[PDB]
Design a protein around this ligand. Structure first.
Ligand code: HEM
Ligand code: HEM
Ligand SMILES: CNCc1cc(-c2cc(C)cc(N)n2)cc(C(F)(F)F)c1
Ligand SMILES: CNCc1cc(-c2cc(C)cc(N)n2)cc(C(F)(F)F)c1
Ligand SMILES: C[C@H](O)[C@H](O)[C@H]1CNc2nc(N)[nH]c(=O)c2N1
Ligand SMILES: C[C@H](O)[C@H](O)[C@H]1CNc2nc(N)[nH]c(=O)c2N1
Ligand SMILES: [Zn+2]
Lengths: 415, 419
C-alpha cells in the first residue's frame, strides 16, 4: 500500500510501517497462504554481471543515503567505480565503510533476532585478505578473544572473502564457533549434544581425536578458497565456560552441566549489495532461554527435563502436573544465576523482549519500520508474560541480510 | 504449488494440497508476512449489505457443491434440485435458507477450518442447536440457557454451537453483545485501578448504563446483552445454577485457595460471525472446554487482565527485584498447576497444553492423511507458556483460509443505532 499499521494489544500502541515498501526479496508467503512458521522457505548460483549491477547500485544508493551523501560527487563516482569493476572483473570490492555499514544493517534487518537493539554497536573484523585455513583460524581466534572479553561480551563479526565463482568459497563448517560434540553410542543413547552428532562424525573423520565426553568443545573445521577444510583446536584458554548451578538447589551443580559463554553463529551467509560473504561468523551474548530451554530441554538436545524433575521430586506420572514446565523454569533460573555469578554477559527473556519492543518502537520512529518474525522473537517459554507476545509485527526481507546456506559437506567437491 | 511442512523434532514431513481450495487472502504477500497481525485481511466473500444475485449465488453454489461433494453425490438429483431451490429462493428473497444437514455440515466445517483453534481434533463431535426460528431477545436468552446447560453437562463438557437467524439486510442483525457467554465484570475504580476483569470494563459499563446492578466484585458474572432482529439489546441474568465455576486451589500451596480465585468452566465464544455459503450468522455462540493455559496464563496473568502474578509471587516469597530471578515464570507455572488441579478435582473438563498440543499434532496428521492438509496458525496454536516443550512449537504449519469459517466482526456498540 503506502502505510501498514501494527498494534500492541497490551499497550494499544499503534505504529505505522512504511519501510516494508523497500523490501525486495520474498518472504515465502503468497497472497492466499502464510508460511510464517516455515523455518527455511546450486553453488553456481553466483550472480551474473547483469544481475549484480542493480543489486550493487541499490546498496551503494542505500549507503550514500544513510550518510546523507545521496547524489553527491563521491556517490556518483563510487557508482561509476563499482560498475567498472562489475564490467571488468564480474564482481566488485566493498570499501571498508560499506562493509561495516553492510554488516551492521544485515544485523539490523535480521527479523528473527531479538537482540537488535545493539545492532549499531557491532565490531566488524575485515578478513577479506585471508587466503588459507590457518589464516581463518587466526582471525577466528582473535574474534573469540575480542568478543569474549573476559566475560564482558562484545558483539563482533569477522568477514572472510566473498564468493567468486562458487568454487572458491570460504566456509566455517561449524554451525557455531564454539559448540559441544555429540557422540552416538552403540546402544542408541547420545553423549554430548545430539544436534552435533553428524558434524562430530565429520570432524572425527577428518582426523579429530575426540575426548568422548559430554562437553567437548568441537574443533574448528575451516575452508578457505574452496579447498578441503582443515581442523584446528581453539585454544582452551579462549573458550569461556560457565558451570551451571542453582541459587537454591544444592544438587543442581551435581548434574555436571556447563555451557560456553559466547554464541557465535558461523554457518550463515552475509549478503551485501549482491556480494555473498559465505563465511562471516558473528557473535553476541546469550539470551538465557537459548541455553536453558532449547539447548538443555529440547527432546533432540541435552534433554534434561526428566533428570531435573526427578531431582526436584516432581510428580512425573501425568503431564497435567506440569512437571516439565516446573523444571524448565528452575533450569533457566540456574543458567541466569550461573552466568551472572560468573560475570558472563547474559540477558533473560524478559529484559531482552522489553528491550526489543523499545528497539522496535525506535526503528519505527526513525526508520519507518522494523521487520520482525514473531514466531522467533517470542521466547520459547513463558511467551505471553513477555511484551513481544502481544506485539503485532510485520515480517519482510531487507538487504543487506543474513541468509541460510546449505551445509558445506552436502555441496563440497573434495580434492 | 504443493507445499510440505516439516516437524523438526520428528522429521515427519506432510504434503499439503488442501491449500489449493483456499478462497480468501491471508493478508500476506510474497514480500510481506502478516502472520502475527490479529486481523490481517478484510477480504470477504460477499460485499457490504444484501448482495445482488450474481454476488450471493456463486457463494451458495460453491457451498452446496461442497456439501453434496462431501456426501458423494454431486450432480445427484437432490444436488441439482437444491441449486434450483437456492436459485429460486435468492430470486424471491435475496437470500436462501440452509437445510438442517447443510447447517450442521457448515458449522462443523467452520470449526474444522479454524486455523487458530488447537482443539479441532473434536471438530466432527459438535452439537448444533438450530435457533433460526428465534425472533426476540427473550428467545435468544432461552436458547443460550439451554446451550449452556447442555454444553456444561454437570462438568462433563460437550462442544456445542447455537445458530440464530442469519443476517438479512444488516439492519436486523441477531447479536450476542457479550464476547463470551460467561465473563466477569470489570470495574473502573475511583483511584484509577481496576476491579475484576479489565478486558470487560467497557462492556461492563454498557451493562451498567443499560440498567444492570453490578454487585461490584472481582468475579461478577456479566449479564447477557442480547440483540434480536436489530432491536435494542436486552439484559438477562444467566441463572447461576447454570454457570459452573471452579474455585482455584493448589495441590501443595495451602494458601493458594485463600487468594479467593475462581473461574467459570465453560468457554463460549459469542461475538464471532459464522459464514456458510455467503450466509452470515452473526449470532452463533459456540463452546467447548478450556485449555488450562487460557485461564492460568492469559486470563490470570496478562498485564491488562487479572494480572495476579505479583500477588502469587509474593505469597511464594520470590525475589521480585529483577527479572532474571524468573519469578513471573515460577508463579506462572504454579497458577497453571492450580488451575488444572482445581478443574480436575471438581471433575470439570479441562485439557493441559501438553496433551492438547499433542492431540493437535495427531489431528494435523489425520487431516493431511485424509484431507490433503490442515490450515493452522502457529502464532495461535503454540501455547502462551512453555512453547518449545510442546510438539506444536517444532511443527511447521501452513495457514490459509477455507470456507465455511468463523470470522470476526465489529463489536455491535460501534455499529448499533439505538431507538
Ligand atoms: C548481542 C546480543 C544478541 C542477542 C541477545 C541475540 C538474540 C538472538 C536470539 C535468541 C536468536 C534466536 C536464536 C535461536 O532461537 O536459535 C537470534 C537470532 C539471530 N541473530 Fe541475534 N542476538 C544477538 C546478537 C546478534 C548479532 C551480533 C548478530 C549478527 C551480527 C545477530 C544475528 C542474528 C540472526 C541473523 C539471527 C536469526 C538467523 C535466522 O534468520 O534464523 N544477532 N538472536
Ligand atoms: C472442545 C475443545 C476446544 C478447545 C480445547 C479449544 C481450544 C482453543 C484455544 C486455546 C483457542 C485460542 C483461544 C485464545 O487463545 O484466545 C481456540 C480458538 C478458536 N476456537 Fe477452539 N477450542 C475448542 C472448541 C471449539 C469449538 C467447539 C469451536 C467452534 C464450533 C471452536 C472454534 C474456535 C475458533 C474459531 C477459534 C479461533 C477464533 C479466532 O480466529 O480468533 N473451538 N480454541
Ligand atoms: C539456541 N540458540 C542457537 C542459535 C543462537 C543464535 C544466536 C546468535 C547470536 C549472535 C547471539 C545469540 N544470543 N544467539 C542464532 C541462531 C541462528 F542460527 F538462528 F541464527 C541459533
Ligand atoms: C483466552 N480465552 C479467550 C478465548 C477462548 C476461546 C475458546 C473457545 C472454545 C470453544 C474453547 C476454548 N478452550 N477456548 C476462543 C477465543 C477466540 F476469541 F479466539 F475465539 C478466545
Ligand atoms: C516450526 C517452527 O518454525 C520452528 O520450531 C521455530 C519456532 N520458533 C523458533 N524460535 C526461535 N527463536 N528459534 C527457533 O529455532 C525456532 N524454531
Ligand atoms: C500480536 C499477536 O498476534 C497477538 O498478541 C496474538 C499472539 N498469539 C495468540 N495466541 C492465542 N492463542 N491467543 C491470542 O490471543 C494470541 N494473541
Ligand atoms: Zn505470512
Amino acid at each position: 500500500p503506502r502505510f501498514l499499521k501494527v498494534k500492541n494489544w497490551e499497550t494499544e500502541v499503534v505504529l505505522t510501517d512504511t519501510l516494508h515498501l523497500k523490501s525486495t526479496l520474498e518472504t515465502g508467503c503468497t497472497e492466499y497462504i502464510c508460511m510464517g512458521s516455515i523455518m527455511h522457505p546450486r553453488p553456481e548460483d553466483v550472480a551474473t554481471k547483469d544481475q549484480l549491477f542493480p543489486l550493487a547500485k541499490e546498496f551503494i544508493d542505500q549507503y550514500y543515503s544513510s550518510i546523507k551523501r545521496f547524489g553527491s560527487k563521491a556517490h556518483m563516482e563510487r557508482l561509476e567505480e563499482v560498475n567498472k569493476e562489475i564490467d571488468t572483473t564480474s564482481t566488485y570490492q566493498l570499501k571498508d565503510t560499506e562493509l561495516i555499514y553492510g554488516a551492521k544493517h544485515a544485523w539490523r534487518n535480521a527479523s528473527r533476532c531479538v537482540g537488535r537493539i545493539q545492532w549499531s554497536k557491532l565490531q566488524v573484523f575485515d578478513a577479506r585478505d585471508c587466503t588459507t585455513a590457518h589464516g581463518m583460524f587466526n582471525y577466528i581466534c582473535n574474534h573469540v578473544k575480542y568478543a569474549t572479553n573476559k566475560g564482558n561480551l562484545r558483539s563482533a563479526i569477522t568477514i572472510f572473502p566473498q564468493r567468486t565463482d562458487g568454487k572458491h568459497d570460504f566456509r566455517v563448517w561449524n554451525s557455531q564457533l564454539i559448540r559441544y560434540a555429540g557422540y552416538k553410542q552403540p546402544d542408541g543413547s547420545t553423549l554430548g549434544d545430539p544436534a552435533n552428532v553428524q558434524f562430530t562424525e565429520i570432524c572425527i573423520q577428518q582426523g579429530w581425536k575426540p575426548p568422548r565426553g559430554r562437553f567437548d568443545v568441537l574443533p574448528l573445521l575451516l575452508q578457505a578458497n574452496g579447498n578441503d577444510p582443515e581442523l584446528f583446536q581453539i585454544p582452551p584458554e579462549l573458550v569461556l565456560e560457565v558451570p551451571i548451578r542453582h541459587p537454591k538447589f544444592e544438587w543442581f551443580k551435581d548434574l555436571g552441566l556447563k555451557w560456553y559463554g559466547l554464541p557465535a553463529v558461523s554457518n550463515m551467509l552475509l549478503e551485501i549489495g549482491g556480494l555473498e560473504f559465505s563465511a562471516c561468523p558473528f557473535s553476541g551474548w546469550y539470551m538465557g532461554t537459548e541455553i536453558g530451554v532449547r539447548d538443555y530441554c529440547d527432546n533432540s538436545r541435552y534433554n534434561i527435563l526428566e533428570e531435573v524433575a526427578k531431582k526436584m521430586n516432581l510428580d512425573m506420572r501425568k503431564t497435567s502436573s506440569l512437571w516439565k514446565d516446573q523444571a524448565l523454569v528452575e533450569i533457566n533460573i540456574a543458567v541466569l544465576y550461573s552466568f551472572q555469578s560468573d560475570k558472563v554477559t547474559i540477558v533473560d527473556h524478559h529484559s531482552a523482549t522489553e528491550s526489543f519492543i523499545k528497539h522496535m518502537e525506535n526503528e519505527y520512529r526513525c526508520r519507518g519500520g522494523c521487520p520482525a518474525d514473531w514466531v522467533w522473537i517470542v521466547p520459547p517459554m513463558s511467551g505471553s508474560i513477555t511484551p513481544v507476545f502481544h506485539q503485532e509485527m510485520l515480517n519482510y526481507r531487507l538487504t543487506p541480510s543474513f541468509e541460510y546456506q546449505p551445509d558445506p559437506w552436502n555441496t563440497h567437491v573434495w580434492k
